[PDB]
Amino acid sequence: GSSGSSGNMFVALHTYSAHRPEELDLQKGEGIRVLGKYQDGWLKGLSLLTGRTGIFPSDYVIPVSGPSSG
């Protein structure tokens, strides 16, 4: 089963309890959608699971791959 649409998929594989009103709560095994790029080491994405948008560490998110590309 492939996502289908062309976008950006990034998992968390970790439980991060947001500490600030800007941070995003990550959940081990949750699909996140990277929207903007905060900076080297920090990115902005919307948790496709919970539905929250915040800044999470790139180290926590890994760039997935698949037949998406041509």
XYZ file of N, CA, C and O in Angstrom:
280
model
N 0.806 -1.206 0.000
C 0.000 0.000 0.000
C 0.842 1.260 0.000
O 1.615 1.499 0.927
N 0.693 2.069 -1.045
C 1.451 3.309 -1.165
C 0.550 4.520 -0.938
O -0.622 4.514 -1.312
N 1.109 5.558 -0.323
C 0.356 6.775 -0.043
C -0.509 7.167 -1.237
O -1.705 7.417 -1.096
N 0.107 7.217 -2.414
C -0.621 7.579 -3.617
C -0.238 8.951 -4.135
O 0.472 9.070 -5.133
N -0.711 9.992 -3.456
C -0.420 11.363 -3.856
C 1.064 11.674 -3.690
O 1.770 11.001 -2.938
N 1.532 12.697 -4.397
C 2.933 13.096 -4.332
C 3.146 14.158 -3.258
O 2.672 15.287 -3.383
N 3.862 13.788 -2.201
C 4.126 14.719 -1.120
C 5.371 14.357 -0.334
O 6.324 13.811 -0.887
N 5.364 14.666 0.959
C 6.502 14.372 1.822
C 6.061 13.595 3.058
O 5.265 14.082 3.859
N 6.586 12.383 3.206
C 6.248 11.538 4.345
C 7.435 11.405 5.294
O 8.568 11.190 4.861
N 7.169 11.532 6.590
C 8.216 11.428 7.599
C 7.654 10.886 8.910
O 6.720 11.451 9.480
N 8.231 9.785 9.385
C 7.789 9.168 10.629
C 8.539 9.742 11.825
O 9.526 10.461 11.665
N 8.066 9.421 13.025
C 8.693 9.904 14.249
C 9.500 8.800 14.923
O 10.655 9.004 15.301
N 8.886 7.632 15.074
C 9.547 6.495 15.705
C 10.059 6.864 17.094
O 11.053 6.315 17.568
N 9.368 7.796 17.744
C 9.750 8.237 19.081
C 8.627 9.041 19.729
O 7.826 9.676 19.041
N 8.574 9.009 21.057
C 7.548 9.733 21.798
C 8.105 11.021 22.394
O 8.770 10.999 23.430
N 7.830 12.140 21.734
C 8.306 13.437 22.198
C 7.156 14.274 22.750
O 6.248 14.665 22.015
N 7.202 14.547 24.050
C 6.162 15.335 24.703
C 6.457 16.827 24.585
O 7.254 17.376 25.344
N 5.807 17.477 23.625
C 5.997 18.907 23.407
C 6.157 19.647 24.730
O 5.371 19.456 25.659
N 7.178 20.493 24.810
C 7.440 21.264 26.021
C 7.060 22.729 25.826
O 6.729 23.427 26.784
N 7.111 23.188 24.580
C 6.775 24.570 24.260
C 5.561 24.634 23.338
O 5.193 23.657 22.686
N 4.923 25.813 23.282
C 3.741 26.034 22.443
C 4.076 26.033 20.956
O 3.207 26.256 20.114
N 5.343 25.780 20.640
C 5.793 25.751 19.253
C 6.257 24.351 18.860
O 6.252 23.992 17.684
N 6.657 23.566 19.856
C 7.125 22.206 19.614
C 5.963 21.286 19.252
O 4.810 21.563 19.588
N 6.273 20.192 18.566
C 5.256 19.230 18.159
C 5.410 17.918 18.920
O 6.522 17.427 19.111
N 4.287 17.353 19.349
C 4.297 16.095 20.087
C 4.428 14.909 19.137
O 3.510 14.606 18.374
N 5.575 14.241 19.188
C 5.828 13.088 18.330
C 5.383 11.798 19.010
O 5.462 11.669 20.231
N 4.919 10.843 18.209
C 4.463 9.561 18.733
C 5.094 8.403 17.966
O 4.928 8.287 16.752
N 5.819 7.551 18.682
C 6.474 6.401 18.069
C 5.509 5.643 17.164
O 4.645 4.907 17.639
N 5.662 5.828 15.856
C 4.798 5.155 14.905
C 3.688 6.051 14.393
O 2.560 5.601 14.196
N 4.008 7.323 14.178
C 3.029 8.285 13.689
C 3.526 8.971 12.420
O 4.679 9.394 12.342
N 2.647 9.079 11.428
C 3.015 9.714 10.176
C 2.928 11.226 10.245
O 1.878 11.779 10.574
N 4.033 11.895 9.937
C 4.077 13.353 9.966
C 4.350 13.922 8.578
O 5.050 13.309 7.771
N 3.794 15.098 8.308
C 3.978 15.752 7.018
C 4.783 17.040 7.170
O 4.275 18.045 7.668
N 6.038 17.002 6.738
C 6.913 18.164 6.826
C 6.458 19.267 5.876
O 6.449 19.087 4.657
N 6.084 20.410 6.441
C 5.627 21.543 5.644
C 6.754 22.550 5.435
O 7.269 22.701 4.328
N 7.133 23.237 6.509
C 8.198 24.219 6.424
C 9.494 23.725 7.034
O 9.533 22.658 7.649
N 10.560 24.500 6.864
C 11.865 24.135 7.403
C 12.381 25.209 8.354
O 12.788 26.288 7.925
N 12.362 24.906 9.647
C 12.826 25.847 10.660
C 14.302 26.177 10.461
O 14.665 27.330 10.228
N 15.147 25.155 10.552
C 16.584 25.336 10.382
C 17.309 23.995 10.414
O 16.688 22.947 10.589
N 18.626 24.035 10.244
C 19.435 22.822 10.253
C 19.270 22.070 11.569
O 19.845 22.447 12.589
N 18.479 21.002 11.539
C 18.250 20.213 12.735
C 16.815 20.289 13.215
O 16.360 19.431 13.972
N 16.099 21.317 12.774
C 14.706 21.502 13.165
C 13.826 21.750 11.944
O 14.172 22.546 11.069
N 12.690 21.065 11.890
C 11.760 21.211 10.776
C 10.328 21.360 11.277
O 10.021 21.027 12.422
N 9.453 21.863 10.412
C 8.051 22.054 10.765
C 7.155 21.116 9.964
O 7.188 21.110 8.734
N 6.354 20.322 10.669
C 5.460 19.391 10.006
C 4.165 19.190 10.766
O 4.067 19.540 11.944
N 3.167 18.626 10.094
C 1.870 18.381 10.714
C 1.652 16.890 10.948
O 1.602 16.103 10.003
N 1.522 16.508 12.215
C 1.311 15.111 12.574
C 0.015 14.583 11.966
O -1.079 14.981 12.365
N 0.149 13.682 10.998
C -1.011 13.099 10.332
C -1.806 12.222 11.295
O -2.911 11.779 10.979
N -1.239 11.976 12.470
C -1.896 11.155 13.480
C -2.742 12.014 14.415
O -3.972 11.953 14.388
N -2.076 12.814 15.240
C -2.765 13.687 16.182
C -3.407 14.870 15.467
O -4.541 15.245 15.761
N -2.673 15.455 14.526
C -3.187 16.592 13.783
C -2.648 17.912 14.295
O -3.261 18.961 14.094
N -1.498 17.862 14.961
C -0.879 19.063 15.505
C 0.309 19.498 14.651
O 0.981 18.670 14.035
N 0.561 20.803 14.618
C 1.665 21.347 13.838
C 2.688 22.035 14.737
O 2.355 22.959 15.478
N 3.933 21.576 14.668
C 4.985 22.159 15.480
C 6.366 21.912 14.906
O 6.501 21.377 13.806
N 7.394 22.304 15.652
C 8.770 22.122 15.211
C 9.410 20.915 15.887
O 9.484 20.843 17.114
N 9.873 19.967 15.078
C 10.508 18.761 15.598
C 11.902 18.581 15.004
O 12.213 19.081 13.922
N 12.763 17.852 15.729
C 14.138 17.589 15.294
C 14.197 16.648 14.095
O 13.557 15.597 14.086
N 14.972 17.033 13.085
C 15.112 16.225 11.879
C 15.646 14.836 12.215
O 15.339 13.859 11.530
N 16.445 14.755 13.273
C 17.020 13.485 13.702
C 15.927 12.501 14.102
O 16.118 11.286 14.037
N 14.782 13.032 14.516
C 13.659 12.199 14.930
C 12.839 11.751 13.724
O 12.124 10.750 13.781
N 12.948 12.499 12.631
C 12.220 12.180 11.410
C 13.167 11.708 10.312
O 14.212 12.314 10.077
N 12.793 10.622 9.643
C 13.609 10.069 8.569
C 12.876 10.135 7.234
O 11.688 9.829 7.133
N 13.600 10.541 6.180
C 13.042 10.654 4.830
C 12.732 9.293 4.216
O 13.638 8.549 3.839
N 11.445 8.973 4.116
C 11.015 7.703 3.545
C 11.170 7.701 2.028
O 11.373 8.747 1.414
N 11.073 6.518 1.431
C 11.205 6.378 -0.015
C 10.207 5.360 -0.557
O 9.599 4.606 0.202
N 10.044 5.344 -1.876
C 9.119 4.415 -2.498
C 8.951 4.671 -3.983
O 9.688 5.449 -4.588
N 7.963 4.001 -4.595
C 7.678 4.142 -6.026
C 7.098 5.509 -6.369
O 6.857 5.816 -7.537
N 6.878 6.328 -5.346
C 6.323 7.663 -5.540
C 6.932 8.330 -6.769
O 6.215 8.814 -7.646
N 8.259 8.354 -6.825
C 8.967 8.965 -7.944
C 8.727 8.184 -9.231
O 8.340 7.016 -9.199
N 8.960 8.837 -10.366
C 8.765 8.189 -11.649
C 9.886 7.226 -11.989
O 9.661 6.022 -12.120
